[PDB]
Design a protein around this ligand. Structure first.
Ligand SMILES: O=C(N/N=C/c1cccs1)C1CC1
Lengths: 300, 237
């Protein structure tokens, strides 16, 4: 039942909160978002009415601190900030609630969509991908490049996704070239799961974060990361049964949530065709294959 | 990127490069079984790995034993090729290792890139050129050493014989590609043109007959004629 107050809304803007969005007018008496469910990460996001081509926002968890938004007229954006004075913050939220100048997080009781998209996403993992250690919240935008994209130019403002490269020495054991290239099980299970992520929950949490950044900001490097992590599982002959069952649920909710009109720029034809019809796991993603065939048969 | 008619002189510059052709690695005869089903019998094959500047040919013979108990042999053949090319580069002194390897078939790019990950500075390239290296097994001395092999073997040849004494690599490669194109289009006709006059022999240490400069011009004319005729009948043109 947490609140993110706004000092003010001086510029006309579309405000996203998770999968929801609403329009605020220039100098509209808007003072923030209340009734935000505890237990999940959340993302508050912005597109200015005067610049539709750019999208930015803040990943946060209300359990980690008291957060508010304030427009900076110098840097020209809505900034998240932490209020360390808990009494001052309670005093501010109470006043704005009493004067009813806040939007209510519009969750339908039946509706598990946000849990389903964020099941394995944890703030401590977000803060390792998005490095700005003096804040407890994480800024992402449309234009931020990944470490992978940078290697193929400012490291401070990059997305530190785990680098996946099917044609790398990390991916291919000397003397196992054909075996490891055609069946990525060793790369998935030994290198990535045992070696880097430690468990499938961390791997799924990064996959789910990558999708959400692709959807909410149009972040191209995030879309590449999401597809590479799906392709690594689908191109492995040996995957734990619980991982395939969970991946099918994860992708089902992602495909269900995607805007119908963005299917063309958010879904890679080659990867999905390979994953559903050619790959080792072509028969393992029943829920995903059914929603993809019924929602985007053109792509396939 | 891709090697084409536009960047053709690059083949004869001082950057070491090799062509790799995998056409003849996995070779079969198709036959009826007693029950009237169809089966294949593998025969010995070869990797054709050629330095187009020097004429040095690294003919790795692929013995049928390689295939015993293996599945998906047309797929394995590309990986075995990449393994053997990789083994060849590693066997050469650093100053003899190629800067680029050009694969005659795009299906060899991923297998060769993966086997050569240790060599990031060696460029793996496709070509738009339709090179007739599949006709290598029409050269009698190359066919002989492949079909007689009882075990894996590497045999070294100079596919230009002594031509570079008299002509440039550009001209030598043009003559090679014209002879192999003729052999590919009509092997019998091409072989008759090469071996009809018995006064012109093949030296023991050579692949092709010992033509004078004048005789090469006649031979080259006879090959172009053979190729155009066959084009006419193909396309009823
Ligand atoms: O190129 C893209 N554009 N997407 C735009 C979007 C606008 C609003 C949400 S997504 C996607 C990263 C692949």
């Amino acid at each position: 039942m947490n609140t993110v107050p706004f000092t003010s809304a001086p510029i006309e803007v579309t405000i996203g909160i998770d999968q929801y969005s609403f329009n605020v007018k220039e100098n509209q008496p808007f003072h923030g978002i209340k009734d935000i469910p505890i237990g999940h990460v959340h993302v508050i996001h912005f597109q200015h009415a005067d610049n539709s081509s750019m999208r930015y926002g803040y990943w946060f968890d209300c359990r980690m601190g008291n957060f508010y938004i304030q427009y900076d007229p110098k840097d020209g954006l809505y900034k998240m900030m932490e209020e360390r004075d808990g009494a001052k913050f309670e005093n501010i939220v109470h006043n704005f609630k009493e004067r009813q100048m806040m939007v209510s997080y519009p969750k339908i009781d039946e509706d598990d969509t946000w849990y389903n998209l964020t099941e394995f996403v944890q703030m401590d993992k977000i803060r390792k991908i998005v490095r700005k250690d003096e804040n407890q919240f994480s800024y992402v935008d449309s234009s931020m490049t990944t470490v992978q994209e940078n290697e193929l130019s400012d490291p401070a403002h990059s997305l530190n996704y785990t680098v996946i490269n099917f044609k790398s020495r990390e991916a291919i054991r000397p003397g196992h070239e054909m075996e490891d290239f055609l069946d990525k099980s060793y790369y998935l299970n030994t290198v990535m799961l045992q070696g880097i992520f430690k468990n499938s929950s961390n791997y799924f949490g990064e996959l789910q974060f990558a999708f959400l950044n692709a959807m909410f900001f149009g972040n191209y490097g995030s879309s590449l990361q999401w597809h590479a992590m799906i392709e690594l599982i689908c191109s492995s002959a040996t995957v734990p049964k619980h991982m395939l069952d969970k991946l099918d649920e994860i992708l089902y909710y992602q495909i269900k949530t995607l805007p119908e009109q963005y299917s063309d720029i958010l879904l890679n034809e080659r990867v999905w065709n390979i994953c559903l019809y050619s790959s080792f796991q072509k028969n393992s993603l029943h829920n995903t294959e059914k929603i993809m065939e019924n929602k985007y048969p053109e792509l396939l | 990127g891709a090697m084409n008619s536009s960047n053709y002189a690059e083949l004869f510059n001082n950057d070491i490069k090799l062509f790799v052709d995998d056409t003849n690695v996995y070779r079969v005869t198709v036959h009826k079984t007693f029950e009237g089903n169809v089966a294949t019998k593998a025969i010995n094959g070869c990797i054709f790995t050629l330095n187009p500047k020097t004429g040095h040919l690294f003919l790795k013979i692929i013995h049928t034993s390689v295939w015993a108990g293996q599945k998906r042999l047309s797929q394995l053949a590309k990986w075995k090729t990449a393994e053997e090319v990789s083994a060849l580069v590693r066997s050469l002194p650093k100053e003899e290792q190629p800067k680029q390897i050009i694969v005659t078939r795009k299906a060899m790019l991923d297998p060769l890139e993966v086997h050569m990950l240790d060599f990031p500075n060696i460029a793996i390239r496709p070509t738009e050129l339709r090179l007739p290296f599949s006709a290598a097994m029409s050269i009698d001395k190359l066919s002989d050493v492949v079909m007689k092999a009882t075990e894996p073997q590497m045999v070294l040849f100079n596919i230009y014989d002594d031509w570079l004494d008299r002509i440039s690599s550009y001209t030598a490669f043009s003559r090679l590609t014209l002879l192999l194109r003729a052999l590919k289009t009509n092997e019998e006709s091409a072989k008759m043109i090469l071996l009809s006059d018995p006064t012109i022999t093949i030296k023991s240490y050579h692949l092709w007959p010992s033509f004078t400069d004048e005789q090469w011009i006649t031979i080259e004319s006879q090959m172009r004629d053979l190729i155009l005729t066959e084009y006419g009948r193909k396309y009823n043109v």
